[PDB]
Design an enzyme around this catalytic site. Structure first.
Site, PDB file in Angstrom:
ATOM      1  N   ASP A  49      -6.705  31.720  23.558  1.00 41.89           N
ATOM      2  CA  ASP A  49      -7.255  30.904  22.477  1.00 41.89           C
ATOM      3  C   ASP A  49      -8.446  30.058  22.947  1.00 41.89           C
ATOM      4  O   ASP A  49      -9.421  29.865  22.206  1.00 41.89           O
ATOM      5  CB  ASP A  49      -6.224  29.927  21.845  1.00 41.89           C
ATOM      6  CG  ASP A  49      -5.337  30.529  20.746  1.00 41.89           C
ATOM      7  OD1 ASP A  49      -5.535  31.663  20.279  1.00 41.89           O
ATOM      8  OD2 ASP A  49      -4.530  29.734  20.160  1.00 41.89           O
ATOM      9  N   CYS A  99     -15.300  40.390  16.604  1.00 42.21           N
ATOM     10  CA  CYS A  99     -14.394  39.306  16.963  1.00 42.21           C
ATOM     11  C   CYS A  99     -14.422  38.413  15.715  1.00 42.21           C
ATOM     12  O   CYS A  99     -14.408  38.959  14.596  1.00 42.21           O
ATOM     13  CB  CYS A  99     -14.817  38.669  18.271  1.00 42.21           C
ATOM     14  SG  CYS A  99     -16.592  38.247  18.477  1.00 42.21           S
ATOM     15  N   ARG A 148     -17.183  37.333  22.330  1.00 39.25           N
ATOM     16  CA  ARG A 148     -16.386  38.419  22.912  1.00 39.25           C
ATOM     17  C   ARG A 148     -17.023  39.776  22.665  1.00 39.25           C
ATOM     18  O   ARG A 148     -17.028  40.652  23.560  1.00 39.25           O
ATOM     19  CB  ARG A 148     -14.957  38.401  22.345  1.00 39.25           C
ATOM     20  CG  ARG A 148     -14.234  37.080  22.576  1.00 39.25           C
ATOM     21  CD  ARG A 148     -12.860  37.057  21.870  1.00 39.25           C
ATOM     22  NE  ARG A 148     -12.355  35.696  21.814  1.00 39.25           N
ATOM     23  CZ  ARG A 148     -11.178  35.364  21.295  1.00 39.25           C
ATOM     24  NH1 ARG A 148     -10.367  36.272  20.805  1.00 39.25           N
ATOM     25  NH2 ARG A 148     -10.843  34.074  21.212  1.00 39.25           N
ATOM     26  N   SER A 149     -17.543  39.985  21.448  1.00 43.62           N
ATOM     27  CA  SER A 149     -18.181  41.272  21.117  1.00 43.62           C
ATOM     28  C   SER A 149     -19.375  41.537  22.020  1.00 43.62           C
ATOM     29  O   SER A 149     -19.614  42.692  22.453  1.00 43.62           O
ATOM     30  CB  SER A 149     -18.627  41.286  19.653  1.00 43.62           C
ATOM     31  OG  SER A 149     -17.539  41.342  18.720  1.00 43.62           O
ATOM     32  N   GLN A 174     -21.684  33.436  23.988  1.00 45.31           N
ATOM     33  CA  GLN A 174     -21.707  32.128  23.317  1.00 45.31           C
ATOM     34  C   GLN A 174     -21.597  30.932  24.253  1.00 45.31           C
ATOM     35  O   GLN A 174     -21.874  29.790  23.819  1.00 45.31           O
ATOM     36  CB  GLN A 174     -20.545  32.033  22.313  1.00 45.31           C
ATOM     37  CG  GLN A 174     -20.780  32.747  21.033  1.00 45.31           C
ATOM     38  CD  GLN A 174     -19.581  32.668  20.069  1.00 45.31           C
ATOM     39  OE1 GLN A 174     -18.508  33.221  20.329  1.00 45.31           O
ATOM     40  NE2 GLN A 174     -19.768  31.975  18.966  1.00 45.31           N
TER      41      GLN A 174
END
EC number: 3.1.3.48
Length: 282
Positions: free
Chosen positions: A181, A215, A221-222, A262
């Site tokens: 998370d 994502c 994440r992508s 990110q």
């Protein structure tokens, strides 16, 4: 510089935030006018994450062709990817319309439906064989065929039917279920194992349309997934694998979608994944 020793140098000097900020400063800025039209407000999850006009995927529809999705076309590596946000309640039909029209064989999902107690994307695929889904706005039917749950990922076989023509196609759903998370994984081993399961399926190969990867926003994440895949392929193709420059590859991909990777922690994790993957390949 080579990658692994550049890596140790940034760790010892503690300069990951400065490296990441220079990528942000150098990244491309292209217009995203279609994303910002008032009629598309409920088609975007985040107001600061939009597809560029020049690379956006168009739906084959004359009323409204807009979806928050981008084509990332890597010329030297000979790989293409579609990166998109997690589907919204009003865009689940558009999402499967895109999969159909772009002739994709696989969907890669890097988030859970709920994380941190909040919804990160719609429940956009069926959970039981006998309870299929119909998307009336785009005239598609979606059926769960089989499901294989492993410790770090789940793979599903899905049937997509175009109800207008009665043609059917098999879609593979690759669901990485264990990204934490907060932060990034401590080791890249399970993420790399997952990448090579996607590869082995044919879903990234030129016989098929581009894989669809998402994502929640379709950039963090992508971005890690496609950056690691492309860098490893370049290391296999070139005479000098130490010439692969992960920062330059990332800036190339940011010509096609804004914001990929990110955080500085995601940047470090991408380096770790490529470094450790380069050893397993040989």
């Amino acid at each position: 510089m080579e990658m692994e020793k550049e890596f140790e140098q940034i760790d010892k000097s503690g300069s990951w935030a400065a490296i990441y900020q220079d990528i942000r400063h150098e990244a491309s800025d292209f217009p995203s006018r279609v994303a910002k039209l008032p009629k598309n407000k409920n088609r975007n999850r985040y107001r600061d994450v939009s597809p560029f006009d020049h690379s956006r995927i168009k739906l084959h529809q004359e009323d409204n062709d807009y979806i928050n999705a981008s084509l990332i076309k890597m010329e030297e590596a000979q790989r293409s990817y579609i990166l998109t946000q997690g589907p919204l309640p009003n865009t689940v039909g558009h999402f499967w319309e895109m999969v159909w029209e772009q002739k994709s064989r696989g969907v890669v999902m890097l988030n859970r439906v709920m994380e941190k107690g909040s919804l990160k994307c719609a429940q956009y695929w069926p959970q039981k064989e006998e309870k299929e889904m119909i998307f009336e706005d785009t005239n598609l039917k979606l059926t769960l065929i089989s499901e294989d749950i492993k410790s770090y990922y789940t793979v599903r076989q899905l049937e997509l039917e175009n109800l207008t023509t009665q043609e059917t196609r098999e879609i593979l759903h690759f669901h990485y279920t264990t990204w934490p998370d907060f932060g990034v994984p401590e080791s890249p081993a399970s993420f790399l194992n997952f990448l090579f399961k996607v590869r082995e399926s044919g879903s990234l190969s030129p016989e098929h349309g581009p894989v669809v990867v998402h994502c929640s926003a379709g950039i963090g994440r992508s971005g890690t997934f496609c950056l690691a895949d492309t860098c490893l392929l370049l290391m296999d193709k070139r005479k000098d694998p130490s010439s692969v420059d992960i920062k330059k590859v990332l800036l190339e991909m940011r010509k096609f979608r804004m914001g990929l990777i990110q955080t500085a922690d995601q940047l470090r994790f991408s380096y770790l994944a490529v470094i450790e993957g380069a050893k397993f390949i040989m």
